[PDB]
From a paper:
XPB is part of the general transcription factor IIH (TFIIH), which is functionally divided into core TFIIH and the CAK complex. Analogous to the stimulation of XPD’s helicase activity by p44, the enzymatic activity of XPB is also regulated by its binding partner p52 (6). We pursued the structural characterization of p52 from the fungal model organism Chaetomium thermophilum (ctp52) using x-ray crystallography. The model shows that ctp52 is organized into four distinct domains, an N-terminal domain (NTD; aa 1–120), two middle domains (MD1; aa 121–319 and MD2; aa 350–454), and a C-terminal domain (CTD; aa 455–514), that interacts with p8 (40).
The second structure encompasses the C-terminal part starting at amino acid 121 (ctp52_121–514) and was solved in complex with ctp8 at a resolution of 2.7 Å. In the latter structure a 28 amino acid long linker region of ctp52 (amino acids (aa) 322–349), that is not present in human p52, was replaced by a short linker (sequence SNGNG). The linker region that was replaced in ctp52_121–514, bridges MD1 with MD2 and could not be observed in our structure due to its flexibility. The ctp52_1–321 model comprises the NTD and MD1 domains and the ctp52_121–514 model the MD1, MD2, and CTD domains. A superposition of the ctp52/ctp8 structure with the cryo-EM model of human p52/p8 within TFIIH shows that the MD2 domain was found to be oriented differently compared to our model. While the antiparallel β-sheet of MD2 (β-strands 8–11) is pointing towards MD1 and is involved in the formation of the dimer interface in our ctp52_121–514/ctp8 structure, it is pointing towards the N-terminal extension (NTE) of XPB in the TFIIH model. This is most likely due to the different conditions and interactions in the crystallization experiments compared to the cryo-EM experiment. However, after the rearrangement of the individual ctp52 domains according to the model of human p52/p8 embedded in TFIIH an overall rsmd of 1.6 Å was obtained, indicating a high degree of structural similarity. We cannot exclude the possibility that the domain arrangement observed in our crystal structure is a crystallization artefact due to crystal packing.
Residue numbers in the entry: 109 to 165, 176 to 238, 254 to 320, 331 to 435
Amino acid sequence: IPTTENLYFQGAAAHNSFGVPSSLPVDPRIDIAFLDNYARKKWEDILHYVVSSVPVHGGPKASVKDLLLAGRLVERRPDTKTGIGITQAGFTFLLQEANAQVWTLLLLWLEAADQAKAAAPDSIEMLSFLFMLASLELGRAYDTDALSETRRNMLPALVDFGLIYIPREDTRQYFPTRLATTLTSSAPSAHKGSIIIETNYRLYAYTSSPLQIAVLALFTHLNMRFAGMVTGRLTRESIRRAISFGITADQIISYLASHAHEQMVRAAAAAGRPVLPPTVVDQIRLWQLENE
């Protein structure tokens, strides 16, 4: 009998508390354009911290750093200068779209409270607040006074996820970002076509169409993953297979560079380093010249 829309509407109406709009005047400089930039800057920091753990050779709050660590997205390493190392889930997280990344962090946030509850704000209270936020209007100011004490205690973790914006000047108002409004919506991709090349010759990529799967298979040891995702390792055999298809090392390097991950390019450009690892790029050319 009941569909997805029926169960959602039932869970949303289940709790009588809803978003009260602030009767107080709104600062003109807090527009939909500002809130989009704010939410973007919050997530760019989270993503930069994840990109920081990628092997080569001022950060988000403890509320974010710990959830990524406990969520096995980034493992603790006692050898690195940064003291952290990226996992398989970490690279998957990087290729995920904006909405999916928020739900990775949200579901882990819900999981952390129940684990702290079992050892002794619970899941029911947290979910109900997320359900309310999804029904809010983007750009509109809402009364913080109207929120319950438990819901008020959730705001610092929710601002850390770039879902809510509370001005330093007026704590009486809370602004939901585009991430809050569109949270449970859809009832122009961000990382489709991207390729991630590691220092250990490993590949992580989200193919645009099966044409890219066929293209990557010419020079990489592929293995199909969920949706358009593919994973593999660059070997002498795979690189020399490309030679038999008329693909040169120069064409391989130029393809991996042009199709590189947005955030990984950003971190490389901000430092004094090229996107693709130089050690790998030299080995791509060597294998193509290693013939008889």
